[PDB]
């Protein structure tokens, strides 16, 4: 049976929660427990109505992201192929309830401070059901930090970050992520000086330049377990190809070009056109405090851009690890 | 941006 929003968000917890994101189809929040930050999703499912203008999705199509969400968090304590690049999932609940009266507060504060292209959600009754997913919390995202990097050597390694985790979940589950956009990668202060993943049994380490990356957002994912294979079909999807402003709407196209609309297959290709659409950002809509003001950082230009003219002639992000020059 | 808006 389905439990209580007090389950998820004891009243401390609660009190604790501020806003951090939105979309169409659900509201994330920030909280603490323990003393340590964690990120809560929050997705009506199964009622009749309208939210944010879109029909609710149903527990059967949110179960591919619940289900991929936990096979890429449990990459960090395996052996073979090991990554903590993408983001830690702590639990799943299915909650039911109106809304928190709690949540409403940092609702609206979000929507008086940022603005909200979501309804105020204060017209639930007390029999919606919704699933709640508590993840790390991960940082903040890459587009939020267009302006708040030091300098492209910290694009770089956010470039490794992401091909090296990307490439390990293409070895282990046959992974595309299919919707990484700079909205869909965080940042995070580290300590470490190094990085550390295994691919295949082969242990390497990436200079994390103090920043550790993490993948979110698995709604668009699809990978595979003993031929089972977890996607979301968009094929007859009327909205998602028809993008236009910004070179990411053009990659939802460029992918369904190399798989022939046909979305249950494997096509690595597709994290290689986010990895280039994420390069093409680094070197066009970022800014950093600190500019390539050294021959030795001109270099480290040179090469980022020798990056985003060559990597497209790859077939995976695991290719491109393990045979781009930029990596060496 | 989101994948798609309302
Ligand atoms: C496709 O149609 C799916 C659709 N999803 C939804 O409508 C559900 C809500 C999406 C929320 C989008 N915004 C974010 O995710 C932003 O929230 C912050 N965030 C998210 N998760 C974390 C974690 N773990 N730690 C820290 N911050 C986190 C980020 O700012 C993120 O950009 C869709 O819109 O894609
Ligand atoms: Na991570």
Redesign the interface.
Known sequence: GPVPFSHCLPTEKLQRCEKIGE??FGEVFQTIADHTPVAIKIIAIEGPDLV???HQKTFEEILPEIIISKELSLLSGEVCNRTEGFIGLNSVHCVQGSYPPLLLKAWDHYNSTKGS??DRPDFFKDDQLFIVLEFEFGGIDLEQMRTKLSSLATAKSILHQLTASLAVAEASLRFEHR?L?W?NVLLKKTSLKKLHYTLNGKSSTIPSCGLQVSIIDY??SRLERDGIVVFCDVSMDE??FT?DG?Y?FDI?RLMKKENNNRWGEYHPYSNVLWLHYLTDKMLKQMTFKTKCNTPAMKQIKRKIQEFHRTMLNFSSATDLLCQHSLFK | ?6
């Open positions: 979309g169409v944010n203008g879109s292209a979501n919707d956009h909205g709604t668009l909205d998602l993008g910004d990411q939802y | 941006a989101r994948k798609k808006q309302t």
